[PDB]
Amino acid sequence: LDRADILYNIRQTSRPDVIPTQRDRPVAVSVSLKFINILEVNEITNEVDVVFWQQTTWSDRTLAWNSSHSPDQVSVPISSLWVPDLAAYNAISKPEVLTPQLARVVSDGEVLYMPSIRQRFSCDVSGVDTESGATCRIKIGSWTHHSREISVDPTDSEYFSQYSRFEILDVTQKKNSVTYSCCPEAYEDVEVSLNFRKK
Amino acid sequence: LDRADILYNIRQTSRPDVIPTQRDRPVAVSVSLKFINILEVNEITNEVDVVFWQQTTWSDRTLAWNSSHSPDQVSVPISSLWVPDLAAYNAISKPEVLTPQLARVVSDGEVLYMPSIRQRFSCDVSGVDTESGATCRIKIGSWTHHSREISVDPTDSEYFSQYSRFEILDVTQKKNSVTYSCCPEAYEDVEVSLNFRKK
Amino acid sequence: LDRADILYNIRQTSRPDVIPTQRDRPVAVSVSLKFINILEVNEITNEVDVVFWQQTTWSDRTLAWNSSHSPDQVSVPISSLWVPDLAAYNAISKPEVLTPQLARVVSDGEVLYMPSIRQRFSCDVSGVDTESGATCRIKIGSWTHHSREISVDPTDSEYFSQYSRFEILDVTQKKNSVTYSCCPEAYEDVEVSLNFRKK
Amino acid sequence: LDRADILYNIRQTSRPDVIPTQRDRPVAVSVSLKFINILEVNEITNEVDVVFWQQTTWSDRTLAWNSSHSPDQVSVPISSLWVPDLAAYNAISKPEVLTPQLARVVSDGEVLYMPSIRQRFSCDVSGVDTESGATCRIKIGSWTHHSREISVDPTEYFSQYSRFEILDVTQKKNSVTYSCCPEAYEDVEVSLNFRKK
Amino acid sequence: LDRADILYNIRQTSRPDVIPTQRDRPVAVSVSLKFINILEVNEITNEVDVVFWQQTTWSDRTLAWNSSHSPDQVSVPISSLWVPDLAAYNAISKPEVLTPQLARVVSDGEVLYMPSIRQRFSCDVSGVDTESGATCRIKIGSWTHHSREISVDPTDSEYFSQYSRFEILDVTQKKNSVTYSCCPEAYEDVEVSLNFRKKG
Numbered sequence: 003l004d005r006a007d008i009l010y011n012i013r014q015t016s017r018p019d020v021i022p023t024q025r026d027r028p029v030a031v032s033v034s035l036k037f038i039n040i041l042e043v044n045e046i047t048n049e050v051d052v053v054f055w056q057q058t059t060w061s062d063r064t065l066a067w068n069s070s071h072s073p074d075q076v077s078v079p080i081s082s083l084w085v086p087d088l089a090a091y092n093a094i095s096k097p098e099v100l101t102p103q104l105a106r107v108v109s110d111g112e113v114l115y116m117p118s119i120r121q122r123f124s125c126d127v128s129g130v131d132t133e134s135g136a137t138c139r140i141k142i143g144s145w146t147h148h149s150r151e152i153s154v155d156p157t158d159s160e161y162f163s164q165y166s167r168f169e170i171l172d173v174t175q176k177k178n179s180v181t182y183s184c185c186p187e188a189y190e191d192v193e194v195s196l197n198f199r200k201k
Numbered sequence: 202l203d204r205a206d207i208l209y210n211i212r213q214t215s216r217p218d219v220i221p222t223q224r225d226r227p228v229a230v231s232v233s234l235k236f237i238n239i240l241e242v243n244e245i246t247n248e249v250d251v252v253f254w255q256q257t258t259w260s261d262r263t264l265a266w267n268s269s270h271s272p273d274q275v276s277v278p279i280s281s282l283w284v285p286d287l288a289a290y291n292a293i294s295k296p297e298v299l300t301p302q303l304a305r306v307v308s309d310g311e312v313l314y315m316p317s318i319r320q321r322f323s324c325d326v327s328g329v330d331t332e333s334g335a336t337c338r339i340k341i342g343s344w345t346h347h348s349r350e351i352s353v354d355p356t357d358s359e360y361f362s363q364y365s366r367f368e369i370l371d372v373t374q375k376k377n378s379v380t381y382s383c384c385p386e387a388y389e390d391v392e393v394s395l396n397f398r399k400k
Numbered sequence: 401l402d403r404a405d406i407l408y409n410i411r412q413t414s415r416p417d418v419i420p421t422q423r424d425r426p427v428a429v430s431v432s433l434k435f436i437n438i439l440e441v442n443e444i445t446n447e448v449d450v451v452f453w454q455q456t457t458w459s460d461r462t463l464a465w466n467s468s469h470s471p472d473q474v475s476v477p478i479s480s481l482w483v484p485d486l487a488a489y490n491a492i493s494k495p496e497v498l499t500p501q502l503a504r505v506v507s508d509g510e511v512l513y514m515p516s517i518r519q520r521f522s523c524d525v526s527g528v529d530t531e532s533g534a535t536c537r538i539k540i541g542s543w544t545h546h547s548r549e550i551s552v553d554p555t556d557s558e559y560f561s562q563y564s565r566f567e568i569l570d571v572t573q574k575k576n577s578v579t580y581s582c583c584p585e586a587y588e589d590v591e592v593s594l595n596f597r598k599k
Numbered sequence: 600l601d602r603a604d605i606l607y608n609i610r611q612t613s614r615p616d617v618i619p620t621q622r623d624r625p626v627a628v629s630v631s632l633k634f635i636n637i638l639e640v641n642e643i644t645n646e647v648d649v650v651f652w653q654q655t656t657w658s659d660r661t662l663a664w665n666s667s668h669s670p671d672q673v674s675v676p677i678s679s680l681w682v683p684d685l686a687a688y689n690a691i692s693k694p695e696v697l698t699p700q701l702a703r704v705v706s707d708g709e710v711l712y713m714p715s716i717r718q719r720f721s722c723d724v725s726g727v728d729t730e731s732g733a734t735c736r737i738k739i740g741s742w743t744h745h746s747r748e749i750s751v752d753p754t755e756y757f758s759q760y761s762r763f764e765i766l767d768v769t770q771k772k773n774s775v776t777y778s779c780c781p782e783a784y785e786d787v788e789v790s791l792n793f794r795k796k
Numbered sequence: 797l798d799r800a801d802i803l804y805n806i807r808q809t810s811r812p813d814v815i816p817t818q819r820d821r822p823v824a825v826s827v828s829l830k831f832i833n834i835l836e837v838n839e840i841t842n843e844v845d846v847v848f849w850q851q852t853t854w855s856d857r858t859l860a861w862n863s864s865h866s867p868d869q870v871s872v873p874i875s876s877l878w879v880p881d882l883a884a885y886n887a888i889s890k891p892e893v894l895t896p897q898l899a900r901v902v903s904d905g906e907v908l909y910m911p912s913i914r915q916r917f918s919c920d921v922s923g924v925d926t927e928s929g930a931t932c933r934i935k936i937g938s939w940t941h942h943s944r945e946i947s948v949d950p951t952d953s954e955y956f957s958q959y960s961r962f963e964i965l966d967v968t969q970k971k972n973s974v975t976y977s978c979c980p981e982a983y984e985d986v987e988v989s990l991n992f993r994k995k996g
């Protein structure tokens with residue numbers, strides 16, 4: 003098998019509309035935000051503009067191939083793959099995807115999709131100009147798949163811009179499972195707490 | 202039947218361009234706005250920027266399948282389903298859909314579509330800085346389907362952001378059936394009255 | 401014939417790229433603006449932001465069907481129909497279509513397309529703050545079809561927002577047939593004069 | 600032949616990706632800007648926002664049909680035609696096309712494409728508030744086709760409600776060689792002399 | 797062969813989703829920014845708005861044809877070609893492509909894609925109003941292809957607008973090969989250092 007064949011097979015059979023559950027277990031999705039920049043804070047309106055890499059991994063066995071005498075990985079357009087329907091609950095703009103929309107697929111079916119995203123959020127900006135800083139919580143999970151279909155789990159300034167007006171003090175993560183009035187089932191989310199301040 | 206089969210059949214036969222009327226009864230659509238945020242009020246211009254979940258439900262039997270030994274529900278891209286042509290009469294911007302455009306379909310054909318929307322409206326902003334607050338009325342209904350084809354019915358701070366500069370005092374709903382100069386038939390709408398104030 | 405059949409036939413045979421002239425007569429298009437809002441006036445720059453329903457009607461016999469024991473009308477995506485190539489000569493932004501892009505088709509081939517549009521225009525804003533008000537003239541006609549192929553004809557505050565900062569005094573319409581330097585034939589337009597003032 | 604036939608044939612055989620050179624001569628493209636409005640001048644940043652009709656004509660024989668007992672012209676979506684890859688070198692925003700994207704095609708293969716465009720440019724805005732006015736120069740030519748493949752040549756509607764007025768418009772053709780490439784690329788430079796009223 | 801045939805073959809067989817590696821060597825991509833304008837500097841936020849031609853070249857032998865009695869080059873929509881997945885790491889807006897999205901392909905499979913791009917960046921704007929000026933560093937590389945699949949290499953005011961409020965003092969380039977926490981492999985990048993200042 004060469005790359006051409008692998009990409010051909012994936013395109014012909016991938017089923018981007020079909021969540022790749024195994025034996026009625028949820029697809030285990032990992033999410034991890036790598037913050038790159040904080041662009042436009044407003045303590046009055048409690049809105050912040052953030053740029054981050056949304057590192058997202060999950061498994062889709064339907065993509066697997068025998069890697070004997072074959073490449074172990076290919077880059078694939080996400081339009082050819084099932085992708086988790088993650089959304090940020092407290093986003094107040096749609097995600098602006100800054101990078102090429104390609105996912106990396108390993109021969110065993112492991113997928114990594116890691117767009118760089120710019121997005122605005124409604125969160126607690128109070129304290130941003132103090133030494134303790136602000137703590138902005140960003141909430142992410144599947145919009146339409148409950149906990150039996152998708153589980154969501156977590157996996158600081160490492161890639162944060164030195165030229166930002168802000169600095170990151172700490173980043174913490176917490177997993178939740180919430181029942182909403184609209185629906186009987188629970189929906190998982192990750193809450194990423196970004197503790198930052200003006201320099 | 203597995204998910205793949207169900208989604209395949211739906212894609213192959215769905216008829217997104219065909220309103221699923223039963224026995225010449227209107228498609229009964231329920232609409233309900235869950236307000237998430239109020240972002241940019243202007244009492245001078247009487248314009249407001251709102252984020253809300255537009256909970257929308259209706260029935261389409263053409264989607265139904267036998268759920269015996271099969272999943273009871275699937276998430277489906279709305280491009281593969283008929284969707285009611287709802288519009289907000291007093292919107293002054295097009296709806297920015299913030300979430301993945303997926304509907305949830307149950308085996309009996311019940312559909313739930315619940316995008317998170319950011320949109321600007323022209324409405325009464327007077328009194329927003331008083332204790333009584335402003336009452337902003339949002340009017341939603343089918344743009345091209347009259348009351349024999351589509352009926353529209355309703356179904357507060359529960360999901361409203363604590364970080365908003367505003368707070369919700371009350372939300373009320375009212376159903377209407379209006380005849381317009383352009384056409385002989387009546388068109389139904391729901392009017393959602395959002396009573397809110399600056400904190 | 402049911403809706404499914406009618407929409408299937410329309411989709412299979414409609415020819416959205418083909419102007420439905422009959423016997424070498426122009427397609428007679430009617431255009432009528434129902435003003436909904438006036439949002440952002442600037443008497444210095446002579447620019448105005450307007451929301452209006454662009455009521456547009458014409459006939460396309462290729463869409464007709466026998467309505468005996470059949471629905472008399474269907475809603476159809478405009479991407480499946482020929483639509484007149486109307487443009488506003490003095491627009492300075494592209495039309496923001498706020499409503500679902502569906503036209504209503506009657507079994508005899510009458511079409512009604514009535515999007516709600518937000519658009520900015522260059523026009524006479526002088527006097528807007530006086531009692532006489534301003535008169536803003538909006539000019540609309542086929543961009544590429546001359547008078548032998550498309551004719552354009554007209555057909556006040558009825559739907560105008562009570563919450564606008566402005567009010568409508570009067571709306572008048574006038575038909576014209578103009579020869580431009582670019583081309584030998586005449587092109588029809590409708591000029592809609594919107595007389596409005598600050599409240 | 601009726602319109603439906605002509606449009607069908609064009610759709611089936613047009614080859615929008617294929618530049619219609621004849622006998623290895625360049626496609627001769629005419630370009631002409633009809634200025635409609637000047638919207639947002641900034642003398643400090645030297646940026647201007649303009650609306651103009653970009654009158655563009657060229658010939659594509661592969662579109663031709665026998666007009667005997669047939670319509671002489673049809674309107675065609677540009678997605679079904681080859682169109683010259685013109686760009687404005689000093690544009691600092693992408694062209695906002697305000698009109699329906701249709702070209703007019705004559706039975707002999709003459710094409711006219713005339714979108715109304717709003718676009719921002721980096722140009723000389725100095726003197727806009729004087730009697731001499733500013734002269735803003737707009738430079739347009741094929742982005743990827745050199746002079747042997749595309750030649751570009753120049754060949755009333757300005758809004759009375761603009762804050763500006765047009766004193767003069769002049770045009771000049773150029774053939775320039777760039778560091779990136781061995782061949783010459785043609786352009787038209789349109790000089791818009793305008794001032795605040 | 798005429799252009800029609802060449803473009804027809806390319807469209808029918810191009811495989812825009814398939815990186816054209818040769819014998820398991822990386823596709824060697826050259827990148828070079830020709831700066832055209834600097835539009836909106838902010839020394840407080842350290843953000844800059846730049847317009848530049850992103851000269852990008854690489855080889856794709858699957859596009860090659862016999863140029864005997866045939867045109868030596870054609871312009872091709874990039875939607876019909878594989879194109880490197882280059883991204884600017886420090887961009888804070890998506891690239892606004894100002895020009896027609898066509899690449900030039902030579903009969904030997906050499907490709908030149910050279911869009912004009914307007915984009916905002918987070919970079920060091922300090923000193924912009926001084927004689928030394930600011931130095932803004934722009935970092936560009938493949939987003940998803942490591943060094944064994946794509947290598948990235950470099951190739952001043954020449955096309956820079958005389959009407960900008962800024963002027964260019966110097967442009968330097970540096971190639972890097974970086975390993976990120978997310979993945980075991982190294983990813984190459986070019987860092988383009990734009991040294992510029994406000995005029996006056």
Ligand SMILES: *[C@@H]1O[C@H](CO)[C@@H](O)[C@H](O)[C@H]1NC(C)=O
Pocket residue numbers: 466467468469
């Ligand atoms: C119209 O439909 C009806 C009922 O099926 C039929 O009686 C009539 O002949 C039809 N006319 C045409 C032209 O098909």
Ligand SMILES: *[C@@H]1O[C@H](CO)[C@@H](O)[C@H](O)[C@H]1NC(C)=O
Pocket residue numbers: 862863864865
């Ligand atoms: C290249 O095309 C020429 C001209 O017809 C032909 O003579 C020659 O055999 C071809 N060469 C290759 C490598 O196929």
Ligand SMILES: C[C@H](CCOC(=O)N(C)C)N(C)C
Pocket residue numbers: 144145146147182184185189254303304305313314315316
């Ligand atoms: C809160 C958010 C609401 C939107 O959900 C849907 O559209 N469903 C189909 C569940 N989910 C429950 C995470």
Ligand SMILES: C[C@H](CCOC(=O)N(C)C)N(C)C
Pocket residue numbers: 342343344345346381383384388453502503504512513514515
């Ligand atoms: C008021 C508003 C006007 C638009 O109507 C349509 O476009 N039709 C096709 C009816 N409707 C009737 C709800």
Ligand SMILES: C[C@H](CCOC(=O)N(C)C)N(C)C
Pocket residue numbers: 542543544545580582583587652701702703711712713714
């Ligand atoms: C004013 C306007 C200019 C655009 O014309 C075209 O695009 N043609 C193809 C005629 N026409 C003459 C109505």
Ligand SMILES: C[C@H](CCOC(=O)N(C)C)N(C)C
Pocket residue numbers: 741742743744777779780784849898899900908909910911
């Ligand atoms: C200056 C400008 C650069 C971009 O050129 C390309 O994309 N080529 C395909 C030539 N051209 C040469 C006019």
Ligand SMILES: C[C@H](CCOC(=O)N(C)C)N(C)C
Pocket residue numbers: 055104105106114115116117938939940941976978979983
């Ligand atoms: C740092 C940056 C992050 C994005 O990576 C991807 O999306 N892969 C598919 C690896 N790359 C590795 C250059």
